[PDB]
């Protein structure tokens, strides 16, 4: 019968595939191709866990920081993720896919150039990311209740962006985009184990930094203390944790200790692993909002959305809505004491809400979006491509003209 | 259908005439400094076009101007699969312009290809091997293209193969 | 972001309607009265006969540049087309040295002309004139190709 | 956010070079003023050691940051003689050794951070100097071996001489 | 036959003083750098930095020592040596585009100025404000100037146009100098007024340069034409068309001889003789070298004379896009080529 | 500025 | 200097770059940004060579900026930071330029339009106090453009670092309804190509990195006449590419951001300003005057400030007057536009006629006493010393 | 307006 449309959430750790109307994804598999190491032999390769354990195969990892940088491999990613995985004829089915707000538009031009004249789509539609993750929020909020305003923090394994959205509109121009996330927190807990920890295979150095994370790390409200209480009081905040070695089989066991708060320290002073960079994130988000209208910074304060994989850290809105309203209740303090003390200005309302589904948030963004019929207008059609060419999809909104 | 020793002998010397070329900053616009064979704002100081061809379907044009210069390409297409395969070997080279600084963007009209060739090019590159490229272009495009007729009709038996095999 | 007011003054294109446009000079004398260019009957009066190197400087001799007209100097190139197709390969050299310079540079203006719209083997014939003109010429005649504002 | 700096500082507080000379508690000799209190510029840059090498960017608020700086990239010299130290009475013997080294000083090559520290002008402000850091070269090295040293082995914990590569941006003084 | 690589970018301009000691290019950027001669070496002692945009045109008065500049900017900048460094002295050109070639004039008390806004700006001195203001003369003009050289009445002009022509003017300017002599090209020399015009518009005329005499002037053109007209003959014009690429610079060795470069890279040389009324081609001068076979590597933009004057010179510059000076002696190339012969 | 914009 | 000998010095107290001069002078003697940098220590950086003091300012901070972490205490022509901008005055008046006494000078200043008065009561409380200047007057932006240029009549457009201001005069009459300001300077400017260049992966986020994009912006970037063909050219060509190399020997590339950056003065919504370009505000501005003023005012177009040296923009700004002039006076006759006299005055000198404007209303005024403003005058009413210029103080 | 003030 009538066919719903494909949903591919292409990011770099992980990648979001199935089919439009459903609520979770079909498909959740790592971002990775492994190949041999002419003629047919380009097709010799797998995509996903099928491309992990492949001993004799090369894994490549084609994404970085969102963005592709081999479209030799994601334009193989991309034919296995449809004939393959979803088994989609491409020549029916429509498709949603995501970009994030810094995919540069010469990337946004040879996507379209592949699935429309490689796969010959009748359709494509190329969403922001994280406005998608705000979307499914307001399907746990109450219905009418609804909270069109809303502030985003999309953070995943490659880059961070904080985008603001008013009454239903994105304000592009004052998106801020940290190129700190979930790869650059691994190979930092990755680098204080190699320090300390030796007897970690090298092979299973990763393996081994996102287990300690996703296990055992945390968010501290001091960093100083913290190191105190894991010297004067050891037992009680150094875990243990015991790997297998995949060549000999035999156990290996570690001690984790400053390598569960260091790691996601890197959000609130990512100096740590880039030193290009400085300002926290509790910081970036209040530039973000003062430079947003002056009408749409209560509501922004109050509905703050944390989306992505790299959110999951426990204590971590408890420790950004604190950043914030010292750096709020501060500023009105001293607007108070400039006037003449003579109102006391209304309080700013916090909020930092941690919703339940982050794995697949973009995604279900995306295919509430996808089951409706305004999809099917706003797509770029094969049509509008044969005439106006790849560039019809060169546009986002973080930019004008 | 001519022979190919005295069309490359042509355009080289065509080229060598059109790349004597200097800086020159603009006359309509305050500072500007662009390429007036683009641009064609200035009739005076656009020389003549000059065609040279082998035949009806090969050929090029070196438009110059006193700071640049815009040599269309035509390659020969006898066949359907040879259309397509020069039409994507040309995008997939205009996609590194960035890196052969001599090209653009987008063909001319009815060409296959064009270059862009202006004056801080000559000063900072070789001249005389810039048109070493375009020559070793024209004639190594016939042969890189039947390489890869030849490698889609050997994957066209391996996939008849790896099929018909099972039965 | 987008705007909400009214652009589209940024349309129009106001230098169209220019006075420092570049003008070009013609000649007043040929406005009135066109150069006739080398007669058919002249050179082909030669042809019949053979004597296609008597037939090739009477084509060269006449030659209809100052005329803004265009059918003259087509029908004057298609003579001279005419002429250059039918000489024989080992005969170019002994024709192409009698010149003097003004008219190789004048051969070779109708040269870069006979490549714009070629017949079958209109063109394998004038790459080897090319090779002689230019052996002669150098490429100071190409130049006054290029740089010359008056066509053939 | 911005790294941890010194508290101490006081108009009352004297200056050497551009350092500030702060009170020290120790049974060592030099000119440092006795401290009476629990808390000096040594058991801060101790406190905030461990902090401060991760950090890439450090600011220049006053003159006990110059002092503090010093201290927290000796205490990367202490780790590398101290983590080859099989007990604690190894470490001090071997602490002691160090501090009579004379390092090089405000001025002279060797010392990495010559533009934005201050040489003693005349001689006796040299000798003041040489024999201040001294005082904090010796107090520094006697209070890393109580908490270096696990009492359960009586040797090197892995907790501190994983800071063995991590100076304090890059600078060492060597 | 010398060359010294100052760089490995072009040199859009250069300029030398009068004792030859020093040296003023500009090395396709917005500075000029001074070089001075010290034994066999070059060591730079001076770098004026006030232009917004690139160098185009150079040159140096020889008795005052001033440096004057243009630049695409629309600007020029007279500089004056005030103990160790060069301070500038400002302009007033009044252009809506950039300028494109500069030259004093011999007597030092005027300069001329050539710009893409289709006019050439005589300036003067005005110590009522400090200024340097300028006067127009864009009569005939019809789009760019190129070069420039002047008369050694120090009022007459000649202006290498890219209108393909090459006027003669009359830059007299009479708050600072009477009214001038007579001269074969004409007695009627108001400010602005086109003595002669060339009749040839083909190729964009890049390098003019009067004669020692006064009465013969040559130009070089794009379409591989030298020309040189002589007023003593009615101001009839001689071709010479090459059989190589164009010319871009020329200058008057003697009264007979010229000496051109371009983007051959090289120099030749070329002969008049009036009896005959035509000028022939002299041979190239440089020996082909024992792919390019010379010593400049790129064209060459601008030549200059050194030692002797257009009189009779014994020594001429060359300047070019490969970022070189290449000194040349003449005597040194009539004895190193025994065909050579300099009329 | 004291209030809207910055200074 | 003026009879008794004292010295007559112009100082501009920019937001981006100080201009300070003596009365007369035909260039300014020093021409510095107005920076102000500390020291600090980085990981990447080692330098040990070069002294660095506790406070650098001006050129030694800008050149040393990869030691520093520099702060600018102007920002859109108001002053934030008062004890870093007598460090700046210091300098200004100290022996590496103008080694001056204050005591025994005259000294004119500038405050742009439509600012707070607490910015400049503040500076004239600073300069009768502080340094104790004998004489000071407070100038505006705009009548100085007119000196400079040697008008009575004629609209300006003053743009900065932070401020982008335009006043009209007409025979010298002020007419302070009109004044407008637009947001946007090079500044506004200069934090754009940041956000474009990050698209290419070029990351400029510290304090001193914010000059280097200056100098990337104040060499390649540039007005587009017609933006529709230069767009073509980035779309087809790739001759806009140019490269620059940074201190650190990293070598970049940029395009189409050369014109992108500063078509926000025309196009300003690309910086999320709600509004009208330079252009279409001009326009709106003289159609607001009086009818009969308004034909002297499109031959007096006077462009002044460092953000008006864009390559292009004075040809792009005739190009965009005379659309609206067709669209909406003319209401579209092309024939009529032959007859509308429209004259840009885009002198190359440009760059500084606030400052040469002030080095001749001192000249003329050197020698007067009913101009300045004394410090006797100060003592005795105080910051109502002001009402000499009108501007109502207490 | 269409002359005097903008309506
Ligand atoms: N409980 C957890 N705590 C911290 N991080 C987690 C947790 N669970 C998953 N992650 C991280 O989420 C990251 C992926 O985020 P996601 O946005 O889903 O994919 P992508 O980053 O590719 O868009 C992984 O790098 C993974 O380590
Ligand atoms: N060549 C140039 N092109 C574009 N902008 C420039 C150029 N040179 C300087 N500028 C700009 O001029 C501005 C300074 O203008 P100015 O008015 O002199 O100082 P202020 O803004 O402090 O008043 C700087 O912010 C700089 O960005
Ligand atoms: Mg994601
Ligand atoms: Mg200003």
């Not at chain 1, 963005?67 to 429509?94: G, N, S, T």
């Not at chain 5, 007459?156 to 009359?170: E, M, P, T, V, Y």
């Not at chain 7, 932070?162 to 200069?190: K, M, N, Q, W």
Request: charged content about 25%; glycine content about 6%; overall charge neutral.
């Amino acid at each position: 019968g009538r066919l719903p449309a494909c949903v591919v959430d292409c990011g770099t750790g992980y990648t979001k595939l199935g089919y439009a109307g459903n609520t979770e994804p079909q498909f959740i598999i790592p971002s990775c191709i492994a190949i041999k190491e002419k003629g047919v032999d380009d097709l010799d390769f797998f995509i996903g866990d099928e491309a992990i354990e492949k001993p004799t195969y090369a894994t490549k990892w084609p994404i970085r920081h969102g963005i592709v940088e081999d479209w030799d491999l994601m334009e193989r990613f991309m034919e296995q993720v449809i004939f393959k995985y979803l088994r989609a004829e491409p020549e029916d089915h429509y498709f949603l896919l995501t970009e994030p707000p810094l995919n540069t538009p010469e990337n946004r031009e040879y996507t379209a150039e592949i699935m429309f004249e490689s796969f010959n789509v009748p359709g494509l539609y190329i969403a922001v990311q994280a406005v998608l993750a705000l979307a499914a929020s307001w399907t746990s909020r109450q219905v009418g209740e609804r909270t069109l305003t809303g502030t985003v923090i999309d953070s995943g394994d490659g880059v961070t962006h904080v985008i603001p959205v008013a009454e239903g509109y994105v304000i592009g121009s004052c998106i801020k985009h940290i190129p700190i996330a979930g790869r650059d927190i691994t190979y930092f807990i990755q680098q204080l184990l190699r320090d300390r920890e030796v007897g970690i295979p090298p092979e299973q150095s990763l393996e081994t930094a996102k287990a300690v994370k996703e296990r055992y790390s945390y968010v501290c409200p001091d960093l100083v203390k913290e190191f105190n209480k894991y010297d004067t009081d050891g037992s009680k905040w150094i875990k243990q944790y015991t790997g297998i070695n995949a060549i000999s089989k035999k156990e290996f066991s570690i001690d984790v200790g400053y390598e569960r708060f260091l790691g996601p320290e890197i959000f609130f002073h990512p100096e740590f692993a880039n030193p290009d960079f400085t300002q926290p994130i509790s910081e970036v988000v209040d530039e973000v909002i003062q430079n947003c209208p002056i009408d749409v910074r209560r509501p922004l304060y109050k509905n703050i959305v944390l989306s992505g994989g790299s959110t999951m850290f426990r204590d971590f809105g408890r420790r950004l809505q604190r950043d914030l309203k010292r750096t709020v209740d501060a500023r009105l303090k001293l607007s108070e004491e400039l006037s003449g003390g003579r109102l006391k200005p209304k309080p700013i309302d916090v909020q930092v809400i941690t919703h339940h589904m982050q794995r697949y948030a973009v995604w279900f963004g995306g295919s509430m979006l996808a089951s409706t019929p305004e999809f099917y207008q706003v797509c770029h059609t094969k049509k509008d491509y044969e005439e106006i060419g790849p560039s019809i999809c060169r546009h986002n909104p973080v930019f004008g003209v | 259908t001519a022979t190919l020793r005295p069309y490359l002998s042509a355009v080289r010397a065509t080229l060598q005439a059109a790349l004597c070329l200097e800086n020159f900053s603009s006359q309509v616009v305050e500072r500007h400094n662009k390429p007036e064979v683009e641009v064609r704002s200035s009739k005076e100081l656009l020389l003549q076009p000059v065609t040279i061809s082998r035949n009806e379907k090969e050929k090029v044009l070196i438009e110059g101007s006193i700071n640049s210069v815009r040599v269309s390409i035509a390659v020969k297409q006898a066949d359907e699969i040879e259309k397509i395969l020069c039409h994507k070997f040309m995008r997939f080279m205009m996609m590194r312009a960035e890196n052969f600084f001599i090209l653009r963007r987008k063909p001319v009209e009815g060409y296959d290809i064009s270059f862009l060739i202006t004056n801080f090019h000559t000063e900072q590159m070789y001249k005389h091997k810039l048109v070493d490229f375009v020559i070793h272009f024209m004639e190594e495009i016939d042969k890189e293209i039947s390489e890869m007729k030849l490698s889609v009709n050997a994957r066209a038996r391996i996939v008849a193969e790896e099929f018909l095999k099972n039965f | 972001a987008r705007n909400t007011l009214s652009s589209r003054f940024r349309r129009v294109d106001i230098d169209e309607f220019d006075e420092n446009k570049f003008v070009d000079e013609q000649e007043e004398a040929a406005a009135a009265a066109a150069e006739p260019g080398p007669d058919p009957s002249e050179v082909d009066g030669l042809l019949r006969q053979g004597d296609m190197l008597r037939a090739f400087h009477a084509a060269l001799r006449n030659s209809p540049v100052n005329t803004k007209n265009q059918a003259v100097k087509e029908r004057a190139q298609g003579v001279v087309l005419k002429v250059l197709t039918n000489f024989k390969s080992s005969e170019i050299e002994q024709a192409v040295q009698s010149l003097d310079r003004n008219g190789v540079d004048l051969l070779m203006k109708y040269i870069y002309k006979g490549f714009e719209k070629p017949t079958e083997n209109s063109s394998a014939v004038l790459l080897q004139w090319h090779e002689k003109a230019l052996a002669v010429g150098g490429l100071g005649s190409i130049i006054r190709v290029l740089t010359a504002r008056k066509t053939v | 956010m911005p790294a941890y700096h010194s508290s101490l500082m006081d108009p009352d507080t004297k200056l050497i070079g551009n350092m500030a000379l702060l009170p020290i508690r120790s049974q060592f000799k030099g000119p440092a003023p006795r401290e009476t209190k629990d808390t000096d510029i040594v058991d801060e840059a101790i406190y905030y050691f461990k902090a401060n090498v991760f950090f890439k960017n450090y600011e220049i608020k006053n003159e006990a940051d110059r002092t503090l700086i010093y201290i927290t990239l000796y205490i990367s010299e202490c780790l590398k003689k101290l983590q080859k130290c099989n007990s604690k009475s190894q470490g001090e013997k071997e602490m002691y050794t160090l501090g009579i080294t004379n390092f090089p000083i405000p001025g002279e090559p060797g010392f990495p951070l010559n533009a934005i520290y201050a040489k003693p002008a005349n001689k006796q402000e040299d000798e003041v100097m040489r024999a201040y850091l001294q005082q904090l070269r010796q107090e520094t090295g006697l209070r890393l071996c109580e908490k270096v040293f696990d009492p359960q082995n009586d040797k090197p914990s892995k907790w501190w001489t994983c800071f063995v590569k991590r100076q304090f941006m890059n600078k060492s003084l060597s | 036959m010398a060359y010294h690589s100052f760089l490995v970018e072009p040199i859009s301009c250069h300029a030398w003083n009068k004792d030859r000691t020093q040296i003023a290019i500009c090395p396709n950027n917005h500075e000029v750098h001074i070089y001075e001669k010290s034994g066999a070496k070059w060591t730079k002692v001076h770098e004026l930095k006030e232009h917004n945009g690139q160098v185009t045109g150079i040159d140096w008065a020889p008795e005052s020592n001033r440096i004057v500049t243009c630049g695409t900017d629309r600007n020029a900048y007279v500089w004056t040596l005030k103990g160790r460094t060069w301070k500038p002295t400002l302009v007033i050109l009044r252009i809506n585009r950039a300028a494109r070639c500069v030259r004093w004039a011999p007597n030092e008390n005027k300069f001329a100025v050539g710009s893409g806004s289709r006019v050439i700006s005589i300036c003067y001195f005005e110590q009522e404000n400090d200024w340097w203001v300028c006067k127009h003369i864009k009569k005939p003009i019809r789009s760019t100037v190129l070069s420039l050289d002047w008369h050694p009445n120090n009022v007459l002009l000649a202006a290498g146009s890219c209108d393909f022509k090459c006027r003669i003017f009359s830059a007299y300017i009479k708050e600072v100098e009477e009214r001038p002599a007579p001269t074969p090209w004409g007695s009627k020399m108001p400010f602005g007024e086109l003595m002669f015009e060339s009749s040839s518009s083909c190729g964009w005329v890049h390098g003019v340069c009067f004669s020692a005499s006064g009465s013969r002037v040559a130009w070089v053109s794009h379409d591989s034409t030298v020309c040189l007209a002589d007023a003593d003959k009615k101001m009839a014009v001689a071709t010479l068309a090459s059989e190589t690429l164009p010319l871009l610079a020329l200058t008057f060795i003697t009264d007979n001889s010229l000496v051109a470069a371009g983007h051959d890279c090289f120099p030749v040389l070329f002969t008049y003789d009036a009896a005959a009324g035509m000028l022939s081609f002299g041979g190239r001068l440089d020996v082909p070298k024992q792919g390019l076979d010379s010593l400049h590597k790129n064209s060459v933009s601008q030549i200059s004379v050194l030692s002797g004057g257009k009189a009779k010179c014994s020594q001429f510059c060359t300047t070019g896009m490969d970022g070189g000076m290449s000194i040349w002696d003449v005597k040194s190339l009539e004895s190193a080529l025994k065909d050579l012969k300099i009329k | 500025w004291x209030a809207x914009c910055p200074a | 200097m003026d009879s008794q000998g004292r010295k007559v010095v112009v100082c501009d107290n920019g937001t981006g770059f100080v201009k300070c001069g003596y009365a007369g002078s035909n260039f300014p003697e020093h021409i510095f940004p107005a920076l102000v940098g500390r020291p600090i220590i980085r990981s990447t950086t080692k330098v040990g060579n070069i002294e660095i003091k506790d406070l650098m300012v001006g050129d030694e901070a800008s050149e040393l900026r990869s030691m520093l972490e520099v702060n600018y205490p102007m920002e859109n022509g108001i002053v934030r930071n008062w004890d870093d901008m007598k460090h700046l005055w210091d300098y200004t008046f100290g022996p590496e330029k103008l080694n001056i006494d204050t005591r025994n000078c005259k000294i004119l200043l500038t405050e742009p339009p439509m600012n707070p008065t607490k910015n400049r009561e503040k500076i004239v409380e600073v300069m009768f106090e502080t340094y104790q200047f004998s004489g000071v007057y407070v100038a505006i932006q705009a009548v100085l453009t007119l000196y400079a240029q040697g008008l009575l009549t004629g609209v300006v457009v003053d743009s900065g670092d932070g401020v982008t201001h335009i006043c009209p005069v007409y025979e010298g009459f002020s007419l302070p309804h009109l004044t407008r300001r637009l947001d946007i300077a090079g500044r506004d400017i200069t934090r754009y190509l940041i956000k474009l260049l990050l698209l290419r992966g070029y990351a400029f986020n510290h304090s001193a990195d914010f000059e280097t994009v200056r100098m990337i912006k104040e060499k390649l970037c540039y007005v587009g006449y017609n933006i529709e063909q230069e767009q073509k050219l980035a779309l087809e060509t790739t001759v806009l590419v140019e490269s620059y190399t940074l201190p650190d020997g990293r070598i970049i590339k940029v395009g189409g951001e050369r014109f992108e950056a500063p078509e926000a003065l025309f196009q300003p919504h690309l910086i999320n300003v709600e509004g009208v370009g330079v252009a279409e505000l001009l326009f709106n501005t003289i159609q607001a005057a009086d009818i009969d003023t308004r034909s002297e005012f499109y031959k007096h177009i006077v462009l002044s400030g460092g953000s008006t040296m864009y390559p292009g923009l004075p040809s792009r700004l005739e190009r965009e007057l005379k659309q609206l002039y067709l669209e909406r006076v003319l209401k579209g006759d092309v024939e009529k536009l032959s007859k509308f006299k429209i004259r840009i005055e885009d002198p190359p000198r440009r760059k500084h006629m606030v400052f040469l404007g002030g080095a001749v209303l001192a000249d003329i005024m050197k020698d007067k006493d009913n101009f300045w403003m004394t410090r006797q005058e100060y003592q005795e009413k105080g910051v109502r010393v002001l009402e000499k210029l009108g501007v109502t103080v207490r």
